[PDB]
Design a protein around this ligand. Structure first.
Ligand SMILES: O=C(CO)[C@H](O)[C@@H](O)COP(=O)(O)O
Ligand SMILES: O=C(CO)[C@H](O)[C@@H](O)COP(=O)(O)O
Ligand SMILES: [Mn+2]
Ligand SMILES: [Mn+2]
Ligand SMILES: [Mn+2]
Ligand SMILES: [Mn+2]
Ligand SMILES: [Mn+2]
Ligand SMILES: [Mn+2]
Lengths: 216, 216
């Protein structure tokens, strides 16, 4: 079973603390959602320490639809409307219009360019004119309340950043197997060991956030 | 120089004929745009022969923002508005709202699911309700006139399909190097040799289309 597989990484509280510490150190983590939701694991990085090398890893090992988790306030500051008025996708992932930095990029799609775009968008001083639309970076609006309101990787990302004491902006993308199938827990665990990334679940985060009276 | 590098693949007319034949056979090709435009090479596949294995290759070797080139008529049939009213991106790539099949997929992001979504969308009998929005497939509207009107990989794709006698729907995605940089001509040539894919340029196509009085 899943929790038995993850025991390696420690019990739920340890799995959360280790993830937060990795983020504080500028490393990435792997977040699994509920087995009866997507049963998918996303690579998560903090934006403020994001490197080209981390983005290149995300592009070659994940779906390549690298998303930028933003707060509602930041998405509003950037004047980023939802991509679709009536989102009728299964999970209602809160995709905004896609974005590209106006300055400092070429075609927008290289690892370096995506990082430039992401840092431009996450800048607390950012203005809407800093971003062209559409582009190769896919911002998302996190629900107020984080994983205590919606148990998606989007909310996982913002909560991890806030709980680690970091700026509330992160990047995420679904870990994909070489044959195009999506990674499941055994592959995610092995990837985490290979790349020295902690693994944790949304459930771990919800338990942690509820037990430590953590309002963010 | 570039044309010297591509001489291996034949002269421009041969490069076009070989690409068309590969597509007719159900294989992929590599299309370079102008050196003073993106100077990027995209993998291109015909939709009607698209396999999970071809999509998996695109995801692991390219940007992972796998696009679906549609005619304006097909995009209209699907009720796919442009993602942004005033596209202010550099190349004005005609991204529609992103899509996911309503039926036959799980999370939409696996290689198989993206193919399911693409075939659902490309179906000449498709209806708007067949697709949820947003999703993990990124349709584009090709300009009327193809590469004789706009010299983008979008138009390259639709023109290759029409000239090969295939349904005018293809998938495309930018070839990316392992370190996250974008592949340039030497890397594209080597990739084409490895995967037995023909390489050609948009210029090749424009010359071919103008000399063979090819109205599509
Ligand atoms: O699932 C995804 C997209 O389909 C990715 O993990 C990310 O974009 C967050 O989305 P979320 O898990 O919150 O729905
Ligand atoms: O460049 C791209 C996106 O940035 C891709 O090749 C494709 O989506 C077609 O776009 P195009 O080359 O026609 O602008
Ligand atoms: Mn481009
Ligand atoms: Mn997810
Ligand atoms: Mn609480
Ligand atoms: Mn998803
Ligand atoms: Mn292109
Ligand atoms: Mn003509």
């Amino acid at each position: 079973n899943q929790s038995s597989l993850l025991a390696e990484f420690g019990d739920p509280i340890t799995r959360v603390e280790n993830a937060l510490q990795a983020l504080r150190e500028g490393r990435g983590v792997l977040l699994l959602d509920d087995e009866d939701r997507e049963n998918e694991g996303d690579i998560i990085y903090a934006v403020e320490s994001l490197t080209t090398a981390q983005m290149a890893l995300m592009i070659r090992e994940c779906s390549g639809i690298v998303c930028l988790c933003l707060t509602e306030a930041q998405a509003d500051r950037l004047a980023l409307p939802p991509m679709v008025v009536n989102n009728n996708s299964a999970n209602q992932t809160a995709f905004t219009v896609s974005i590209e930095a106006k300055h400092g990029v070429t075609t927008g799609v290289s690892a370096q360019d995506r990082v430039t775009t992401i840092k431009t968008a996450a800048n607390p001083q950012a203005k809407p004119e800093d971003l062209a639309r559409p582009g190769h970076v896919f911002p998302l609006r996190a629900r107020a309340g984080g994983v205590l309101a919606r148990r998606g990787h989007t909310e996982g990302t913002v909560d991890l950043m806030q709980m680690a004491g970091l700026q509330p902006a992160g990047v995420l993308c679904e870990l994909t197997n070489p044959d195009g199938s999506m990674a499941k827990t055994p592959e995610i665990i092995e990837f985490g060991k290979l790349h020295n990334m902690p693994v944790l679940t949304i459930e771990d985060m919800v338990q942690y956030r509820i037990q430590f009276d953590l309002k963010l």
